[PDB]
Amino acid sequence: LACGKLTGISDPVTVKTSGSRFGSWMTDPLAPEGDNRVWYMDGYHNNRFVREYKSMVDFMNTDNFTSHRLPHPWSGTGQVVYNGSIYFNKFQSHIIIRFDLKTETILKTRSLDYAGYNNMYHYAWGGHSDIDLMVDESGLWAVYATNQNAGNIVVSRLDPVSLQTLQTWNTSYPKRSAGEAFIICGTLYVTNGYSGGTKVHYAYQTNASTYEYIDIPFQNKYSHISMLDYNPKDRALYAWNNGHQILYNVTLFHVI
Ligand SMILES: [Ca+2]
Ligand code: NA
């Protein structure tokens, strides 16, 4: 209740026009003040190259960057950068990989048990987006689905070192009907599509194992969203919008 409940999503802010139709971009919520490097991942299929820009302003105003080449390629757009590592779904697998950016090596590899992959339980936009990793106020999560949950979204807390599952919740929401999803304060928010008409219309509260139908609309400025994640440090939503990297601010309601 203290941490906050989503009540509103701001106008989309265009930060850059770049890259293909589909991709992801993000900052590291546990980077020290003021390490404000931008991490950038173009493409959804068999890709390995991560761009590192020095700052938000360098990201916006230049096309200069450090490149990293992942020893394994990723699927989808569901990566997350967390405490100096990139977490991602190995191409054509339900394998999750922790790639340490400080040493430029893989630190951990592990199967995400029972997770669908290879366009089995993609988000509605497709693109091998079966497994979505994200970070909120309390840590690392994986958002996916399983046969046993009938293709409905499954949410698991993930240990950032072991990559083992710490706790799992089964929701009622068919992942392939979700445009995308993100977590704020332990609540999973799911969008109705990737081109509407867009809005957050389902919330699943993990602390109470309860879901609710809600209506928090937000503007899809460039007509296709293929990535959408919350950053707890920035308190913003990062999105890839049809070859545009955009930010939304949000409002949370707090009860102390
Ligand atoms: Ca997401
Ligand atoms: Na993600």
Residue numbers in the entry: 225 to 480
Quote the original article.
Olfactomedins comprise a large protein family (PFAM: PF02191) with seven phylogenetic branches. These multidomain proteins contain a ~30 kDa olfactomedin (OLF) domain and are predominantly expressed extracellularly in a variety of tissues of multicellular organisms, particularly in vertebrates as well as selected invertebrates. Here we present biophysical, biochemical, and structural characterization of the OLF domain of a second glio-OLF, that from M. musculus (94% identical to R. norvegicus), and H. sapiens noelin/pancortin/olfm1/hOlfA (npoh-OLF), which are both neuronal OLFs, but from different phylogenetic subfamilies. The OLF domain propeller blades are arranged radially around a central hydrophilic cavity.
For npoh-OLF, the point mutation C221G, before the start of the structural OLF domain, increased yields sufficient for crystallization (not shown). The 2.1 Å resolution structure npoh-OLF(C221G), and the 2.05 Å resolution structure of glio-OLF were solved by molecular replacement using search models derived from myoc-OLF and npoh-OLF, respectively. Npoh-OLF exhibits the expected OLF five-bladed β-propeller architecture with a short α-helix; no major conformational changes are seen between our mouse glio-OLF structure and the previously reported rat glio-OLF. Npoh-OLF has a clasp that extends longer than that of the other OLFs because it forms a crystal contact with the outermost strand of blade A from a neighboring molecule. Similarly, for npoh-OLF, Ca2+, but not Mg2+ or K+, confers thermal stability, and the Ca2+ ion is resistant to chelation by Quin-2, except under denaturing conditions. An analogous pair, Trp 349/Tyr 418, is found within npoh-OLF, and in the structure appears to be in a conformation that seals off the cavity. Myoc-OLF variants K423E and Y371D are associated with severe cases of glaucoma, and K423E is one of the least stable variants, supporting the importance of this feature in maintaining the structural integrity of the domain. In npoh-OLF the corresponding residues are Lys 399 and Tyr 347 and the interaction is part of an extended hydrogen-bonding network; the hydroxyl group of the Tyr stabilizes the carboxylate side chain of Asp 356, which helps position this residue for coordination to Ca2+ (and see above). For npoh-OLF, 18 of 20 total Arg and Lys residues are solvent exposed, with a large positive region concentrated at the top face of blades A and B and extending into two small positive patches involving Arg 400 of the short helical turn and Lys 423 of the loop between strands D-16 and D-17.
